């Protein structure tokens, strides 16, 4: 298995969701960026794995579930099988990464992308190891009911640039946003 990563878009007041929808108007190029980063695998003959909680999975419109060209794993203790269209189910983040080491996935998975929601972000972010955060800063306040966990800048270093990540300010639908990459290793 390659690198472990979170990827998120977040408003200025830290909001990542409002009733399981985007707090902001849909940004098509911001979504393109999400699909590119998560789908692109270095290693030939492998796909990236995406890991998400159950609410995050059910927040995706049906036409976009599973995320195509990526292996989809949902986290849940209540579910007893992967939801319709998903590939894998695990009880917890720890268990999902342990699986990634079994024979049915060890040779299949390149990068792992945690795509939410806020409790799965929080445990990944607080767990020791090499982890990057791909964070889009939406530079406006948007009403939200779910939030990104605090980024501890003592541990996470913001990278001065990163291949395939535009560094300058973007704007769609009248909303300015920018891409950032953070990296810890502890
Ligand atoms: C969990 O699945 C998806 C989530 C999102 C939200 C999202 C959007 N942008 C960024 N940078 N990160 C995110 N996590 C965007 C998506 O496609 C644009 C997803 O695939 C269906
Ligand atoms: C591309 O993936 C998403 C797209 C949208 C906006 C959207 C875009 N197209 C359609 N048909 N329905 C929608 N709700 C909304 C989302 O979250 C509610 C998505 O999940 C990350």
Swiss-Prot record:
Protein's UniProt name: Dihydrofolate reductase
Keywords: Cytoplasm, Disease variant, Methotrexate resistance, Mitochondrion, NADP, One-carbon metabolism, Oxidoreductase, RNA-binding
Subcellular location per the Swiss-Prot or TrEMBL entry: Mitochondrion; Cytoplasm
Binding-site positions, NADP(+): 9, 15-21, 54-56, 76-78, 116-123
Record has Ligase as a keyword: no
Gene Ontology MF annotations: dihydrofolate reductase activity; folic acid binding; mRNA binding; mRNA regulatory element binding translation repressor activity; NADP binding; NADPH binding; sequence-specific mRNA binding
Subunit organization: Homodimer.
EC number from the UniProt entry: 1.5.1.3
Pfam family, any one: DHFR_1
Keyword match Ubl conjugation: no
Gene Ontology biological process terms, A to Z: axon regeneration; dihydrofolate metabolic process; folic acid metabolic process; negative regulation of translation; one-carbon metabolic process; regulation of removal of superoxide radicals; response to methotrexate; tetrahydrobiopterin biosynthetic process
């Amino acid at each position: 298995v390659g690198s472990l990563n979170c990827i998120v878009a977040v408003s200025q007041n830290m909001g990542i969701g409002k009733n399981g929808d985007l707090p902001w108007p849909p940004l098509r190029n911001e979504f393109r960026y999400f699909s590119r980063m998560t789908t692109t695998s270095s290693v030939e003959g492998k796909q990236n794995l995406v890991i998400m909680g159950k609410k995050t999975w059910f927040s995706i419109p049906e036409k976009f579930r599973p995320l195509k060209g990526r292996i989809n794993l949902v986290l849940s203790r209540e579910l007893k099988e992967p939801p319709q269209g998903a590939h894998f189910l695990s009880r917890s983040l720890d268990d999902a990464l342990k699986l990634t080491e079994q024979p049915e996935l060890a040779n299949k998975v390149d990068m792992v992308w945690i795509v939410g929601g806020s409790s799965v972000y929080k445990e990944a972010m607080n767990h020791p190891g090499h982890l990057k955060l791909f964070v889009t800063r939406i530079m406006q306040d948007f009403e939200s009911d779910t939030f990104f966990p605090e980024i501890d800048l003592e541990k996470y270093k913001l990278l001065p640039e990163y291949p395939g990540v535009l560094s300058d300010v973007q704007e769609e639908k009248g909303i300015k946003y920018k891409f950032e990459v953070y990296e810890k290793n502890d």
